[PDB]
Design a binder for this molecule. Structure first.
Ligand SMILES: [Mg+2]
Ligand SMILES: [Mg+2]
Ligand SMILES: [Mg+2]
Lengths: 288, 280, 278
């Protein structure tokens, strides 16, 4: 299709759900979206795969892991002729531990990149979408699974459009669970349909401290107004002032606070956070 | 528990020289293991002297004093950082210096910022390390370099250079341990004849400043080596305002300095009513 | 002074030597010691010492015996920090071994050679070139001048060719940096192919080019103006390398006919590689 036809077909804000053939959770979620939400087939292709559409929401499918797809937004523009408003990556979470979970997080590398993207670099966070994801997954969760953030981790990082990962953890048995697929599908649709308007009461925060599943950040997001973007877990601390500043500059909604799980943070890192909050005119929120 | 005026020795688990020095302090002096922890590690105590240990490099621990206050409930009188020095050159050395960044910060701290220097403690360090040195190693200052800078308690680094072979040397650890205790026991009362100076010029190991500190009354705080020159008037003033003991002189290694900087130093000394001291 | 001791030799009478010594002390963490050599202070940086003599160093045959007598150790290597002086202006940073192909006019004995240290000189050439922001020539010089009566391996490292260059602060720093780097590193990274060099002018242009281009590390170098020499003299020089000789290299066009044939013959006789350049 010509750019002309693409500019008419994909006019206004387009919201992209990214999937991949190699991820059983991703394919589960895709199946549930197609089965239940009124997606249509289109004449468009992306990475040699069909593009599905439901109003302003699209499903695109790549052929390999999504975590290495730096410059994905450049390729959506090249292949389909538009810059997405948001990318929701529908994904698995893998762990050796038997944690059944429904999670959301932004991608980025506090230090060295081992699973995609660049060192000390961050994708652009979308706090409202992640907060609504936690709230809706929590409501829909009849599985007894943990609904939580994860820390900023893995790629891609070279994305200018706001994005988030939404995931089923932590093994194949959970990835292919029909109900989990349906919960995530229902969540993605609700979030994409509501995050633009529904964010007016949220307080955007960088989160610091605690483990990979960000328990205090999660509790605050479920119970109050905080909407986290990047989250710096204890295992990733300490980081330099320049790295923290970089993360603070990689939010798709203006940062208003730096939040610290105090006992869950390194001394040097919690002091740096406090000093940067003061320096940058952000609220400092100390839990503990 | 930590009532009185605590002097702190800072160590880290990631630095082999630091841990060597830590163990020699504990083995050779009357430190007890307290019931208290700092950064999750034991705190040791000998009278008014404490040993604390962090888990990562110390050079990035800006606001360390705030954390000592937070975790242990006191403001330290001084911090002595027991540290390695690292170089590719085969220089075995026992050194002391203050931290700070003449320009951009690449190894901790903030750009164009300085820790608070403690000249008396560093001069006593040089003198005592020289007296104890039976290794044939070089005892000298280093220039002001690396972090942290965001500290409002006087502090100094005391270091074993320049590779693992030196860092783990038992006698080097013993010398630095013995020096730390002597310095902490004496810097307050032993400095009445010292003349506090900003030092300018020479290379990283500040040879002329070191010679003056070993032979005469001069006690240097911040030292600005030729490789870090030139600096602005405001940067030199900033360093002058980051001494824990009143500055009395600006000392210049003349041939060891850039023209614009040695002129600036001379002018500022006259402007501020400080003694100007020139070698060369 | 127990250890693998390296000596940097200087002299009060040489402005380049004093410039180099100043930069070493300014920048590399030398200490003053209690020790004296030739009545002058000894400076120390780990296993590297700076010693200073009162007169020209080129006449100091048996210098290693005196280091041993005065300081009580045998040096592993001696680096002489020196000026190069020439009537023809050529700003240069150079290295060479000492020896006399014929009559001794500037120290040492006739038809006698110091023990060469090819690895140290090749590393010197490489480092000086890396650090040369002066735009000066960087090269070997021919084997020339004294001292010759030295059993410890040694090399001269020099600033040429006049006072203008000798007092150049940047030149002093380049040489100081080079000496420190070489003394700290010369025993590591070999394999180099050790060669006797034959042919060319005083500044050994073809030998220099080869030593920068590939693996050749020259020891003694016999320039055209010093040729011809006898088979016995060539053999003497060959027996004065601190690292085993593997090749005889000849700048063909830069050599006298009788000498280049001699070298070719001797290489075959000793089972050395013969390298003909041109
Ligand atoms: Mg993920
Ligand atoms: Mg240091
Ligand atoms: Mg010479």
């Amino acid at each position: 299709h010509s750019s002309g036809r693409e500019n008419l077909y994909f006019q206004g804000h387009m919201k992209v759900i990214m999937t991949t053939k190699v991820d059983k959770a991703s394919m589960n979620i895709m199946n549930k979206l197609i089965e239940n939400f009124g997606f249509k087939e289109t004449e468009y292709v992306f990475e040699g795969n069909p593009v599905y559409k439901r109003g302003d929401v699209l499903i695109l499918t790549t052929n390999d892991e999504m975590i290495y797809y730096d410059y994905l937004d450049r390729e959506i523009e090249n292949q389909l002729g538009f810059k997405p408003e948001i990318i929701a990556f529908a994904s698995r979470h893998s762990s050796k531990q038997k944690l059944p979970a429904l999670t959301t997080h932004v991608t980025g590398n506090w230090g060295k990149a081992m699973y995609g993207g660049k060192d000390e670099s961050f994708a652009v966070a979308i706090p409202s979408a992640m907060k609504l994801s936690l709230l809706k997954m929590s409501e829909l969760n009849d599985l007894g699974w943990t609904v939580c953030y994860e820390a900023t981790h893995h790629g891609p990082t070279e994305l200018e459009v706001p994005s988030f990962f939404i995931e089923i953890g932590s093994s194949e048995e959970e990835w292919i669970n029909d109900r989990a697929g349906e919960i995530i599908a229902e969540t993605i649709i609700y979030v994409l349909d509501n995050y633009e308007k529904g964010r007016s009461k949220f307080k955007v925060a960088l989160g610091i401290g605690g483990g990979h599943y960000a328990p205090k950040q999660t509790k605050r997001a479920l119970e109050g107004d905080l909407a986290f973007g990047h989250i710096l877990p204890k295992y990733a601390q300490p980081v330099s002032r320049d790295v923290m500043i970089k993360a603070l500059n990689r939010f798709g909604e203006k940062v208003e606070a730096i939040y610290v799980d105090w006992k869950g943070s390194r001394g040097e890192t919690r002091q740096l956070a406090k000093s940067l909050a003061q320096e940058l005119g952000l609220e400092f929120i100390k839990d503990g």
